[PDB]
């Protein structure tokens, strides 16, 4: 029932969005809508691959960073939990967060300690998973009752890294400033970085800048979860919000999460 002008307008809008997706560095990200005629999600945002820092936010200074030098040939060898200085932040059931497959071991907690730029291993170092980024091709799609969601295009074994939640790092102050501007917003892309001290009170906002993950929906029985990955072991005022599959993800299955912090990880209770 759309007239020629509208039909063409929707067509061009959906193509601009797919162009925006083709420009993302990494596996393919597609756009589909089998539910209605909505061209695509709003185009008023920019995809980024790094946190965008704002006014007032004092980022963790990289200068005071510890760099493990236990890089023999390959990475850092996952059999030497007692050799890395990236792991010195805790010694109990010692071990690297990942196995050989690059998946996140089930004995790994809510905190992952990856190697820094101050370490001596190559980018293929098994403890540089998150840093290597997305490997799974994804698809943004129109759900029937919820807005747009994201589903995997390939099967993803439990423990597989998916992507990080990127955005603008704002202070909990301005966060509230924006909270006073959120009008009839069906979704408020806010993510608090309070895994540790609550003094920093920093929050990630993906409203104008973000990654594909800004499209992920919430759910009660999620298949992905946030893993606080850190490189600057000394200053966790800002760290990476990493999504890892918690269970096997079938191809075309929608990806959903529900942040619970370290209050769903370490406890069987």
Taking CB under 5 A as the criterion, the residue among 29, 31, 76, 170 binding Zn ion is 76
Decide if 226 contacts 204 (C-beta within 8 A).
no
40 is in an annotated binding site: no
Taking CB under 5 A as the criterion, the residue among 31, 115, 225, 230 binding Zn ion is 115
Nearest CA-CA partner of 109 in 220, 202, 248, 226: 226
For residues 118-177, which are near Zn ion according to CB under 5 A? 119, 121, 125, 127
Decide if 207 contacts 182 (C-beta within 8 A).
no
Decide if 83 contacts 95 (C-beta within 8 A).
no
86 sits near Zn ion (criterion: CB under 5 A)? yes
214 is in an annotated binding site: yes
68 sits near Zn ion (criterion: CB under 5 A)? yes
Q: Which is nearer to Zn ion, 142 or 233 (CB)?
A: 233
Bridge partner residues of 138 (DSSP):
29, 152
The angle subtended at Cα 133 by Cα 220 and Cα 151, nearest 5°, is: 40
Q: Which is nearer to Zn ion, 114 or 139 (CB)?
A: 114
Q: Of 165, 202, 209, 239, which one is the catalytic site residue?
A: 165
230 sits near Zn ion (criterion: CB under 5 A)? no
Where is 11: in which H helix or E strand?
Answer: helix 4-22
Which position has the token pair 């099967």? 155
Q: Which is nearer to Zn ion, 125 or 245 (CB)?
A: 125
Does residue 259 have an active-site annotation? yes
What distance lies between CA 174 and its chain's CA centroid?
A: 22
Q: How far is the CB of 198 from Zn ion (least distance, A)?
A: 28
Whole-angstrom CA distances from 138 to 44, 134, 217, 223, 253 are 21, 9, 14, 15, 10
Just list the catalytic residues.
165, 259
Binding residues for Zn(2+): 68, 70, 76, 84, 86, 115, 119, 121, 125, 220
Q: Which chain residues interact with Zn ion by CB under 5 A? A: 68, 70, 76, 84, 86, 115, 119, 121, 125, 127
């Amino acid at each position: 029932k759309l007239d020629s002008y509208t039909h063409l307008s929707f067509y061009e809008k959906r193509e601009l969005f797919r162009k925006k997706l083709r420009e993302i560095e990494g596996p393919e990200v597609t756009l589909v809508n089998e539910v209605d005629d909505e061209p695509c999600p709003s185009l008023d945002f920019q995809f980024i691959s790094q946190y965008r820092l704002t006014q007032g936010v004092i980022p963790p200074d990289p200068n005071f960073q510890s760099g493990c030098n236990c890089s023999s040939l390959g990475g850092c060898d996952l059999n030497n939990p007692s050799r890395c200085e990236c792991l010195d932040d805790l010694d109990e059931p010692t071990h690297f967060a990942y196995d050989a497959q690059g998946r996140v071991r089930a004995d790994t907690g809510a905190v992952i300690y990856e190697c820094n730029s101050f370490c001596s291993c190559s980018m293929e170092c098994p403890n540089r998973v998150v840093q290597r980024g997305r490997t799974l091709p994804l698809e943004i799609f129109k759900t029937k009752e919820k807005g747009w969601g994201v589903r995997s295009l390939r099967f993803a074994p439990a423990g597989t890294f998916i992507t990080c939640y990127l955005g603008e790092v704002i202070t909990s102050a301005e966060a509230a400033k924006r909270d006073k501007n959120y009008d009839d917003d069906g979704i408020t892309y806010l993510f608090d970085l309070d895994m540790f001290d609550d003094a920093s009170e920093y929050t990630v906002d993906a409203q104008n800048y973000g990654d594909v993950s800004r499209f992920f929906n919430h759910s009660c029985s999620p298949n992905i979860a946030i893993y606080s990955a850190v490189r600057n072991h000394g200053f966790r005022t800002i760290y990476d919000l990493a999504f890892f599959a918690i269970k096997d993800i079938q191809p075309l299955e929608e990806l959903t999460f529900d942040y619970a912090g370290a209050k769903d990880f370490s406890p069987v209770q």
